[PDB]
Design a protein around this ligand. Structure first.
Ligand SMILES: *C(=O)[C@@H](NC(=O)Cc1cccs1)[C@@H]1NC(C(=O)O)=C(C)CS1
Length: 256
């Protein structure tokens, strides 16, 4: 089988779930296996922020300090003195995977326990937000804190972005940010044909954890929701984006 082949080739564990919304056909490979969700959670966190606020509320400007800065603050490190609006923070978080921006949004919604509670409310009993950055990226095998599964991430992403946990105007924002992500070119985007729109959010963590979750639109007809998660068995392992791209191609063939 092709996913086993990719695990073999990249010496890694793959977690895959894809749902063709058109036909309810699915592709599944260790779909219920836990991985550290890493930055992929920022997409769901914006979903909860959008539930909580009106669009016009997203213009509240948040002031933060160097204390709030962590690592990978490409957008937030520029605006310490001016602050950024909640909308701008969501943009940075989703499109640049700006860690401080996610931390600030998380705080506005009540922190990790409040995020968990709202995820439970939308039907996700799997995803387990517990920690802020940086600590959430540090997940040891067998630990369930700050993990989810491919199936649950797909189910929660679909629910915010495509179903009825948000109204259309807010769904449109989420999709637009994710469509215009800067960080995923070598992942799920590299395994879909040009001309098929992709909205995605990437993550990376310890044990070589390398994640992408995505909504993929064919030219015509309903979208595919997909999570490709991976991890390796050594703590300081490196990842290869190419695994995610290759796994994506196998999914697309399995569905077409
Ligand atoms: C979320 O996944 C974030 N990852 C971390 O902060 C842990 C690491 C820092 C350096 C290497 S792993 C941010 N998002 C992304 C991404 O989505 O691609 C990366 C690559 C690291 S910062």
């Amino acid at each position: 089988d092709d996913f086993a082949k990719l695990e073999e080739q990249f010496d890694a564990k793959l977690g895959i779930f894809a749902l063709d919304t058109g036909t309810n056909r699915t592709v599944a490979y260790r779909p219920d296996e836990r991985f550290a969700f890493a930055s992929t959670i920022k997409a769901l966190t914006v979903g909860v922020l959008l539930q909580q606020k009106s669009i016009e509320d997203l213009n509240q400007r948040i002031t933060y300090t160097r204390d709030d800065l962590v690592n990978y603050n490409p957008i937030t490190e520029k605006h310490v003195d001016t602050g950024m609006t909640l909308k701008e923070l969501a943009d940075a978080s989703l499109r640049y995977s700006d860690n401080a921006a996610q931390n600030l949004i998380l705080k506005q919604i009540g922190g990790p326990e409040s995020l968990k509670k709202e995820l439970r409310k939308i039907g996700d009993e799997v995803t387990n937000p517990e920690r802020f950055h940086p600590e959430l990226n540090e997940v040891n095998p067998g630990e369930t804190q700050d993990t989810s599964t491919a199936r649950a991430l797909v189910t929660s992403l679909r629910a915010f972005a495509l179903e009825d946990k948000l109204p259309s105007e807010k769904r449109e924002l989420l999709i637009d940010w994710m469509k215009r992500n800067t960080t995923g070119d070598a992942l799920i985007r590299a395994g879909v044909p040009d001309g098929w729109e992709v909205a995605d959010k990437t993550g990376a963590a310890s044990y070589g954890t390398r994640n992408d979750i995505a909504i993929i639109w064919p030219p015509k007809g309903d979208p595919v929701v997909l999570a490709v998660l991976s991890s390796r068995d050594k703590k300081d392992a490196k990842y290869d984006d190419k695994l995610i791209a290759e796994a994506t191609k196998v999914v697309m063939k399995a569905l077409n």
